[PDB]
Amino acid sequence: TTALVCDNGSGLVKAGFAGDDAPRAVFPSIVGRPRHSYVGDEAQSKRGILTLKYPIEHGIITNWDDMEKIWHHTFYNELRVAPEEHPTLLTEAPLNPKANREKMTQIMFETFNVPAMYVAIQAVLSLYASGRTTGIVLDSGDGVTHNVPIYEGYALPHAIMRLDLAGRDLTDYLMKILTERGYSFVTTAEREIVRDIKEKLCYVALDFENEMATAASSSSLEKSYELPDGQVITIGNERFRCPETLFQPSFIGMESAGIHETTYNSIMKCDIDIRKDLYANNVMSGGTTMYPGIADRMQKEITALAPSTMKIKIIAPPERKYSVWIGGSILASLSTFQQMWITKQEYDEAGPSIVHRKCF
Amino acid sequence: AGWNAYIDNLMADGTCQDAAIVGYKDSPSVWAAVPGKTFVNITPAEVGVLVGKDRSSFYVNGLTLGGQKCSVIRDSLLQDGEFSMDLRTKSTGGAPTFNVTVTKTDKTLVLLMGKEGVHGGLINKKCYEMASHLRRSQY
């Protein structure tokens, strides 16, 4: 019978069937209630008249009643499956609290009646999608950025690092600097335009200082963006200042380490004997790692911190916007996974805490 | 019946290649282990690292069990509600590596090593159930 894979993100849910090459459903992680429930696309379309709730904050489920609505919608409306008929693989953020893992397990077995379930760390699934079982993953999404070192499929929690900004923060910063330029973005629709500009026209400069120095004279830097209604926005140095924030969090006022330093700090927390393998298997995942130039810049910066890595290339898979989901589809389709599921019998005997024993 | 029966119980389902019961109170020594394998050779220094106050240095390049180098994956060994640590062995040359769980009872450490390809979750579940039995038995 066919397993399900559901990747629960801060911004986007990706769901589908194990063994498929792509999720069947991708939709916003939002539940909307009136106000005086709608989920996903339909809540988005009616957002003006609803109280919209984002049940997943920085990767962590925080509103269980609304998360149950998201899962019910995923099964019944998007996938059109009876969850009692399908073993279900769910994803979780690195360092997801114990009590949250237990509640997800309880809800799956008691509310949705699944025959079997498993909870996998999102970064571990992206590593598998890249073909590897040992490596370090930089996963940067909408709400959270982590570095997750992994040894033979096991994340190493002591060494997981967090950068306290991700894609939403970058959208906000691009909006700020385009506003300084002279534009105004007051409505929700206008913010979505800025997010699209960010996704289409931004890039990571290899030499940031030189790029700033030469911007005013560049014949190639300025780009224009024309909306369907004929409005035009022009962008210049904001193209590379926006994602520069990943390397220099001071751009949005924070004293935090940038992504090259979190990567280095994470590897240095790991066993001496695995570090070389981590450097050689350093994999980008998540939407916020899609900027052109990110691998070249990471290589440059890591080489400055760890000169032994001069010739080592960063791994930037083309499918990394969906690599978490794809790794889950691969994993749950394999025979090695039959042993890994938590069965209903195991849950009946041990209760929700069984997830602590079985899923790491 | 004695502690060898415990080793038979732990080995019975075919998932593990090695198993041991090691006292860390009253009689500090290997009480039983699978003959000719790795845990039978655990030393008091290695037990000292497992139960010791330093929960950080074993992330420099691991710890050893019977001389076998291992990497720490999760450490909740000294937490009274969890009482477990998960490791995976380290090898050279791309030789296979194996998941290990250690659990802590009132008097013992229970150690289990999976066979090749056996998931760490299965090994943790079995070790935790055995430690839970021993703790219920005042051991």
Binding site: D20, T133, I330 | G2, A5, G23, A32, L134, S137
Partner: peptide, 28 residues
């Protein structure tokens, strides 16, 4: 020497090779 034991309860190719060989299918 160890104390008496209380009674027992009475109630190759590797993972990367399996991953590589997983042939995902188009949707569908």
């Amino acid at each position: 020497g160890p104390p008496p034991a209380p009674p027992l309860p009475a109630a190759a190719p590797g993972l990367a090779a399996a991953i590589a060989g997983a042939k995902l299918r188009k949707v569908s």
